[PDB]
Design an enzyme around this catalytic site. Structure first.
Site: not given
Ligand SMILES: NC(=O)c1ccc[n+]([C@@H]2O[C@H](COP(=O)([O-])OP(=O)([O-])OC[C@H]3O[C@@H](n4cnc5c(N)[nH+]cnc54)[C@H](O)[C@@H]3O)[C@@H](O)[C@H]2O)c1
Ligand SMILES: OCc1c(F)c(F)c(F)c(F)c1F
Ligand SMILES: [Zn+2]
Ligand SMILES: NC(=O)c1ccc[n+]([C@@H]2O[C@H](COP(=O)([O-])OP(=O)([O-])OC[C@H]3O[C@@H](n4cnc5c(N)[nH+]cnc54)[C@H](O)[C@@H]3O)[C@@H](O)[C@H]2O)c1
Ligand SMILES: OCc1c(F)c(F)c(F)c(F)c1F
Ligand SMILES: [Zn+2]
Ligand SMILES: [Zn+2]
Ligand SMILES: [Zn+2]
Lengths: 374, 374
Positions: B46, B48, B51, B67, B174
């Site tokens: 993922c 995250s 990150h 995770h 996730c």
């Molecule tokens: N809230 C939660 O529980 C939770 C769960 C899982 C992931 N996340 C977060 O969600 C986000 C996405 O995760 P993911 O899908 O695994 O990531 P990912 O696969 O990196 O997807 C992100 C997408 O964003 C695109 N992108 C980057 N910059 C821009 C821009 N400026 N405008 C438009 N598109 C852009 C990028 O090309 C990519 O396809 C990340 O920040 C994770 O940390 C949060």
């Molecule tokens: O991708 C799920 C995810 C989150 F949404 C968070 F906010 C975070 F802090 C983290 F560590 C995480 F794994």
């Molecule tokens: Zn995640």
């Protein structure tokens, strides 16, 4: 008789920011098609009107302000079907055209015909019905209630109960409906919940009224003016706190008091800092915070989006989320049926000629609502 | 053969930010009371987890990240009642203690025992089960799934169907559940609505899946990587837009395309600017915007609260708003019954030993989800 004729009457003209209203003669054109000319009976002094004076709100000047009012229809233009001469009415500062995507939406009320977002200070047709000393004078929010007579578009007026006491129900034109609806309709306060209300003026007191009507178990009033606390408790606050009494930020105090954050918080002041404080003090996973206050024009707030990622909901609304023309008559009917009280909001009743004295009472902290009577 | 004994196994240890993971032997202590030791079978990569590497997410180092995973219970500590040795399980990075005010709330899921808000990198008891080169190693979100064996608190594991394909259902730990729930549970997308999804990675694709399941009429994908658009359309996007193609800001583009703003928008990237864009592009009176992306540590966004005052709702959520332990087994059962698909998210499969190549694939833009097999 005045129908079809220009009326010369008294109004409170604001020629420039940060000056007193000028009480003087204006000319009020007759209503055009789909317009309504109203003899004003009572108008409240809302903080939003003071924002025009202070420059907190930007709107074209010179202007006839006023948006919380009630009066009697003097005449109608061609094509008006919803009011008639002699009807009691409340001007609607948020219109209800009935036709736009917002008006058709079950939860929208901010009709696209509004003059708030990008104010022109005109009628719907882009012209003004007011002159003073030979100069055109702007409208305000399609209402301009600081005048013996105004002209409003039909979509900006509601017919109300003929037996309505207009010196009370004018408050349904802004402050009561806004606060009460912010609690019952926008937040949807739940039975047994804990609420925090920031700002204990007319609008914040109305928020308290709505929180109590919705069955909240705890309602914490927050104000820097402790003189506001006694009336807040009268209308339902269970506790009041003054941030100035604490060494800690009040979000921390409220989080402690609520054993981990409130269910519902309301910003009812108009400050960027209290909007972020109010969001922060609601429980991080399921809290809801509603912005009601109006802050200084073109200023951005700063906040950490982790406050939202954990699960908080942050919203705002105009006019308590109420669809204005459907809701105002029903609110007046509910008032007539003793479902809520308006008297707790009214601290002063002055003739219209004392408008400046009424603003000074608001600015000094003394008043909640002054009702000006024509 | 290993119950009550230290297990030596391979894990991916992150000693330093901005460096490759080190695949090397660790010692995994046996589970204490109310703990569960799991033999991992599959774990997804993922963003995250990335990150943590980049310092976008701050958690104590050195650490075993991971995770999004699934495995088989090797042993249980004293007093465990909810899983047994040999059960298939998904670790829950958002715990469900069942006892705190959030777990008791009908809409809360961000349990107060989480290690996300202010990460300690420990078990619930404040200690570590991991040793490497004689040094204690941090846990991550109570899960630490980048290891052949991990130990989790009982409140951080769910038993799932014995017939589950673990190489697929790891995504329910996730990315799938987050995106799908952000649409169906957090935003509550309506039939016939228009949605905008910012970011078309595994989580944004899952958001699209949920918006389509909810009956949205239009689902506009937004990504600066046009290679993401084909798969977004396969899972339900009706059209895709690349902000880099436009002279005007994309909030204006999306407002125009939606004849005045979208019903629902989702930030699924992790940028402050796209969180504000995504809010702005939802209709001003009744739009809803959901923050899903993880923002950079300790940075604040700037926004004009007039965006909210008109009527918008802004919220965020962890794990799609799902109460984790109640929901994960149900989501696996629904996957078994073909109620949603996971294969569209899986673009690459690698052995665990090739974790660094898996991260390279994500950083290059090539992958959606790489699934690592132990
Ligand atoms: N809230 C939660 O529980 C939770 C769960 C899982 C992931 N996340 C977060 O969600 C986000 C996405 O995760 P993911 O899908 O695994 O990531 P990912 O696969 O990196 O997807 C992100 C997408 O964003 C695109 N992108 C980057 N910059 C821009 C821009 N400026 N405008 C438009 N598109 C852009 C990028 O090309 C990519 O396809 C990340 O920040 C994770 O940390 C949060
Ligand atoms: O991708 C799920 C995810 C989150 F949404 C968070 F906010 C975070 F802090 C983290 F560590 C995480 F794994
Ligand atoms: Zn995640
Ligand atoms: N959203 C709407 O439709 C709508 C309707 C009506 C009014 N408003 C706005 O709502 C706000 C309240 O209006 P009102 O009740 O007429 O105003 P008001 O009567 O001036 O009340 C404001 C209250 O805030 C208190 N206050 C000031 N600063 C602070 C502080 N730092 N901390 C805590 N309390 C503080 C102050 O003492 C006073 O009691 C204004 O910004 C109005 O413009 C919005
Ligand atoms: O008090 C109601 C009220 C508002 F909520 C505004 F946002 C505004 F701009 C205004 F002029 C006003 F009168
Ligand atoms: Zn007002
Ligand atoms: Zn309308
Ligand atoms: Zn809990």
């Amino acid at each position: 008789s005045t129908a079809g004729k220009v009326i010369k009457c008294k109004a409170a003209v604001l020629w420039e920011e940060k000056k007193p209203f000028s009480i003087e003669e204006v000319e009020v054109a007759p209503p055009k098609a789909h317009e309504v000319r109203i003899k004003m009976v009572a108008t409240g002094i809302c903080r939003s009107d003071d924002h025009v004076v202070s420059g907190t709100l930007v709107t074209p000047l010179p202007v006839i302000a006023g948006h919380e009012a009630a009066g009697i229809v003097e005449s109608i233009g061609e094509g008006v079907t919803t009011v008639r001469p002699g009807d009691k009415v409340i001007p609607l500062f948020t219109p209800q055209c009935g036709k736009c995507r917002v008006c058709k939406h079950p939860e929208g009320n901010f009709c696209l015909k509004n003059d708030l977002s990008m104010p022109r200070g005109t009628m719907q047709d882009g012209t003004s019905r007011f002159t003073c000393r030979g100069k055109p004078i702007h409208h305000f929010l399609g209402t301009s209630t600081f005048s013996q007579y105004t002209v409003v578009d039909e979509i900006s007026v509601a017919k109300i109960d003929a037996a309505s006491p207009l010196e009370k129900v004018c408050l349904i034109g802004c402050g009561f409906s806004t606060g009460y609806g912010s609690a019952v309709k926008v937040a949807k306060v739940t039975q047994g919940s804990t609420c925090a209300v920031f700002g204990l003026g007319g609008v914040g007191l109305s928020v308290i009224m709505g929180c109590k009507a919705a069955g909240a178990a705890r309602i914490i009033g927050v104000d820097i003016n402790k003189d506001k606390f006694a009336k807040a408790k009268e209308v339902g606050a269970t506790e009041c706190v003054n941030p100035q009494d604490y060494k800690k930020p009040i979000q921390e105090v409220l989080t402690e008091m609520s054993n981990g954050g409130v269910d519902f918080s309301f910003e009812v002041i108009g400050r960027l800092d209290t909007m972020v404080t109010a969001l922060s003090c609601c429980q991080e996973a399921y809290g809801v915070s509603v912005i009601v206050g109006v802050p200084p024009d073109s200023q951005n707030l700063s906040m950490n989006p982790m406050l939202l990622l954990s699960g908080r909901t942050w919203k705002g609304a105009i006019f308590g989320g109420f669809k204005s023309k459907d809701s105002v008559p029903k609110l007046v009917a509910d008032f007539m049926a003793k479902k809520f009280a308006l008297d707790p909001l009214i601290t002063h009743v002055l003739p219209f000629e004392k408008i400046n004295e009424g603003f000074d009472l608001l600015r000094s902290g003394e008043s909640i609502r002054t009702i000006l009577t024509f």
